[PDB]
Paper text:
BV IXα is then the substrate for many members of the ferredoxin-dependent bilin reductases (FDBRs) that catalyze a regio- and stereospecific reduction of the tetrapyrrole pigment. However, during the reaction, a second aspartate residue gets involved and likely serves as a proton donor for the proton coupled electron transfer to the A-ring of the tetrapyrrole molecule. This reaction catalyzed by PebB is a formal reduction of the 2,3,31,32-dien system of the A-ring of 15,16-DHBV. Here we solved the crystal structure of the PebB homolog PEBB (nuclear encoded proteins in eukaryotes are denoted with capital letters by convention) from the eukaryotic cryptophyte alga [name]. The eukaryotic mGtPEBB is a globular single domain protein that shows the characteristic FDBR α/β/α-sandwich fold with a central antiparallel β-sheet, flanked by α-helices.
Both chains showed clear density for DHBV already after molecular replacement, even though chain A had overall higher B-values and somewhat lower occupancy of the substrate. DHBV is bound in a niche formed by the central β-sheet on the proximal and by helices H6/H7 on the distal side of the substrate. Although Asp-219 coordinates a central pyrrole water molecule, Asp-99 is in direct contact with the substrate and coordinates the polar pyrrole nitrogen of the D-ring and the carbonyl oxygen of the A-ring. In our crystal structure, Asp-99 had to be modeled in alternate conformations. Because the mGtPEBB–DHBV crystals were grown at pH 8.5 and appeared in similar purple color, the observed alternate conformations most likely reflect this deprotonation of Asp-99. Contrary to this hypothesis, we identified a flipped binding orientation of DHBV in [name] based on strong density for the vinyl groups. In addition, although the ligand adopts a planar conformation with three of its pyrrole rings, one pyrrole ring is tilted out of the plane.
Author numbering: 3 to 43, 50 to 272
Amino acid sequence: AVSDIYKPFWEWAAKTIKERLGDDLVSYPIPDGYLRKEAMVSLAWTQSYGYQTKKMRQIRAAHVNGGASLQVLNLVFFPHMNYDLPFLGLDLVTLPGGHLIAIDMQPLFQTEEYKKKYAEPCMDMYQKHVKNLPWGGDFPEEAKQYFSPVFLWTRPQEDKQVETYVFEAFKDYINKYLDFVEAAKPVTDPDHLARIRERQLSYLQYRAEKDPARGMFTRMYGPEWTERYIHGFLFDLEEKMESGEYKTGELLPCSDPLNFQPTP
Ligand SMILES: C=CC1=C(C)[C@@H](CC2=N/C(=C\c3[nH]c(/C=C4\NC(=O)C(C)=C4C=C)c(C)c3CCC(=O)O)C(CCC(=O)O)=C2C)NC1=O
């Protein structure tokens, strides 16, 4: 089977991020010791990528490769909390038991107004892709509040379906999301900002505590590295807020040159 089936996914996302965000794009600080992590399982490695703009607090990816039986691309766009933009969540998981694919613009709110603003303009795109990406099935209850009407949840059973149908939805959702980002305007109403902050923290807290990545990273690299990776990078909002680092709509200082390729 394809050993690194998400390498073409990442390469496309990197090219698109770089082109469409241009000079607004700067590196996001990747904590030392979490850029590249390797352990024997064959050699299995985790490669980190991180970026930010004045609208995107954090665009970060974990690309895990431990052979065909263990592949993950976890790519999430986190808006700054002075925007009501949804998250863009792209979880692509390949395990011995098959493929797991979760692609969504995870919403801050489930109101009629929010759905009209962000979900309804995506419905043709959703219906185009869901025809070849059937519903994946049973789904944890607590997570339901964090998914939109255009959630693509599917379990492809052949590599080819990932390389074709999933890849095309992957691209379309990223391009549509960045269209939203381009057009988004800041929120200045303090009441709305307070609610945006609450919903962002709720989502971040759920995934930091409940994401199945915790269990897998723990087996691979142990508990101490895993918790630092999860709370310190993958879902780091609460830490950055509590430490006084996060400032609404402001970039975190980082002088690292932009990187889009594996770092040995
Ligand atoms: C908001 C919640 C949300 C999710 C749960 C994930 C999206 C997601 N990932 C899932 C499942 C899942 N995900 C992984 C593994 C990983 N997922 C990752 O992002 C990384 C980096 C992994 C490994 C290192 C594994 C091993 C499973 C299977 C766990 C199991 O079989 O019990 C599931 C199904 C979980 C289940 O059935 O219980 C979802 C929905 N992303 C999200 O945004």
